[PDB]
């Protein structure tokens with residue numbers, strides 16, 4: 001009864017019926033669901049018995065400042081009482097001292113000598129799924145740090161251990177003996193559609209990641225037909241013994257008089273290490289020839305897709321499996337060590353610290369033992385020079401790898417590239433990744449979920465790792481779910497992504513229900529946005545807003561749109577929907593602006609979400625995640641550029657949520673220079689500054705001009721490094737604190753060479769409204785240079801991250817040309833003295849371009 005309800009609920013939540021998985025009758029799919037159900041149910045059982053503090057670390061992981069004395073006012077209360085107390089504490093005090101102080105006031109008011117010790121409690125942030133615990137001082141917590149900048153007072157609740165336990169309780173659930181050349185039979189093509197004035201060619205390649213194992217073989221030219229017949233042998237120049245484990249056979253069917261039609265790839269060995277034999281029907285994917293990186297599973301739409309039949313020949317009378325790790329380590333155990341001169345050792349040091357020539361690859365390979373012992377972080381370059389088309393060479397390389405020491409997270413993220421398709425090399429990358437903290441993992445999760453699209457099989461090390469970490473952290477679980485869920489309309493990933501979400505759901509029944517409440521809210525938002533789109537092409541904005549409001553006031557709407565966790569942040573609770581405050585934006589897609597309030601949270605419960613359907617939001621999220629990382633990298637070096645890292649989350653097909661930043665308007669709106677306002681100006685250059693002055697009276701203007709200066713320097717650098725163009729007054733926002741930030745991200749990474757942009761209006765604010773202010777202007781250039789030089793020292797981080805994102809399917813992130821842009825913007829080739837001089841030329845060039853509006 002409950003088993004059937006859970007399954008149908010999973011089916012609705014994931015957006016694919018579980019019955020569809022069974023109907024494939026695929027043993028690989030059937031082993032994944034059994035082995036991952038068990039693995040996720042064990043994680044669940046482990047969780048239902050965690051300690052109470054241990055339960056907070058799962059459900060409410062700490063939100064700490066990248067870094068993690070002074071008077072501070074905090075307001076504390078208890079769960080079963082409306083009565084609060086306001087204490088004067090210090091930012092250097094640990095939450096525990098606040099707790100002991102909170103109980104002291106309760107001891108007098110209630111006159112009893114309180115049995116409770118501070119240790120017995122946790123401090124909940126008012127009307128939020130956020131907690132303050134652990135031995136970190138108050139300023140170290142993101143909520144107190146945010147509170148300290150906005151002047152506003154922290155509002156906390158005392159939560160007893162027994163109450164947290166009550167929450168845990170209610171949330172309960174031999175190959176090497178076959179030297180003949182690898183060949184195949186190309187039998188026939190089916191349902192192909194092309195010009196009859198042309199001929200059909202079949203191109204095949206044997207790959208190990210991005211590298212060829214041998215040269216490509218083309219079929220004979222056959223006349224264009226819907227059912228073309230070949231019945232021909234395609235011999236490759238590689239022996240069946242030399243075929244690596246991660247060898248993938250790639251096909252590109254096309255038309256010639258080069259006209260791309262379709263493509264298809266398959267792994268030569270199955271998920272049980274067996275070399276494949278017998279007839280194979282490859283349901284081809286459409287082109288725009290040979291695509292190594294493309295998925296190794298067939299096209300689901302079997303009725304429309306082209307279906308090339310091939311025939312893997314019987315290389316032996318019995319089945320053939322890839323030799324086990326014991327046979328590999330035995331063959332690779334044999335060889336000669338690196339005995340070379342100081343001169344070749346000096347050249348080896350020069351190339352390993354530094355793309356290399358053939359002879360330079362020959363020295364990396366001969367000196368592989370010196371690489372293992374004296375250059376372990378050079379592992380990726382050694383894996384690159386290895387000949388993956390020679391069984392002896394792979395075995396030597398694998399033998400070194402099993403004895404290879406663990407590498408930093410930085411080196412491990414590089415090893416996840418499609419360049420390293422070897423499962424033992426990938427298992428190795430995951431072993432060096434396990435030391436990632438939850439915060440580091442959250443930072444790179446977007447890229448790790450993309451790496452899943454490179455994976456040759458369902459049951460892989462990266463899936464178990466992502467699953468295990470997601471079941472031990474509710475925030476990780478949340479974002480993993482939404483990154484998978486959002487790509488369910490993509491037929492190439494839907495089976496993989498649907499299977500991972502089903503596994504997770506088996507491990508968190510309670511969270512499956514929480515996320516369905518989010519899914520139901522997004523369901524109603526799409527129907528409401530659809531209404532608005534139709535209504536805005538028929539009536540006036542006041543009329544459409546009122547009708548949107550009437551629709552929202554319905555029982556079904558009021559209930560679905562209310563009392564939920566935010567998909568943008570599970571800490572944020574969207575309680576009561578303020579219908580009167582809701583509206584829509586006037587852009588093509590008519591985005592909805594949805595407001596919420598919460599009495600339990602006060603001012604902190606006054607939140608909003610923007611719902612946008614019709615436009616792709618994956619590039620906006622990636623841009624924002626990159627900027628957020630910059631802010632993290634800067635803060636770690638003690639540079640706080642006053643950034644606004646707001647939420648952006650794609651949820652479905654051209655659908656997603658953007659976080660509302662209140663007390664912010666666009667440069668364009670402020671610059672309208674409307675009459676009967678506190679910001680009305682004598683000169684349009686005054687407007688932004690008058691607005692700033694109106695919002696920040698007295699001594700407050702100085703801090704606002706400084707928030708402006710700091711954020712501006714950060715965004716000038718962020719948009720320059722990331723090449724974010726189409727920047728105008730309508731997509732630049734200013735907060736009432738003076739903080740500047742960017743919205744609506746179309747183009748990024750040139751698509752060319754977007755220059756460093758300095759705008760006179762912002763230079764006018766930095767210079768405090770004065771024509772000349774070298775003091776303030778050069779303090780600004782210093783912030784810019786400092787920011788730029790910090791990013792450069794983390795150049796490989798961005799490069800390793802952007803390389804993993806190539807799997808994403810973003811048209812503006814599809815080749816080496818895009819990654820080159822980063823290398824160029826960060827002047828990754830030059831020394832810091834050289835890069836700084838290059839940055840100062842582009843900065844001065846940008847000031848000279850800003851001086852066009854200064855002159856006029």
Ligand SMILES: CC(C)N1CCN(Cc2cnc(-c3cc(-c4cccc5[nH]ccc45)cc4[nH]ncc34)o2)CC1
Nearest residue numbers: 583593610620658659660661662664665666743744745
């Ligand atoms: C409801 C009314 C009283 N408002 C409407 C909004 N404007 C300001 C405004 C105009 N555009 C945005 C905005 C726009 C977007 C946005 C919109 C479209 C694509 C995007 N990609 C990344 C951000 C983004 C996100 C935002 N978060 N917080 C504010 C925004 O805010 C103030 C008055």
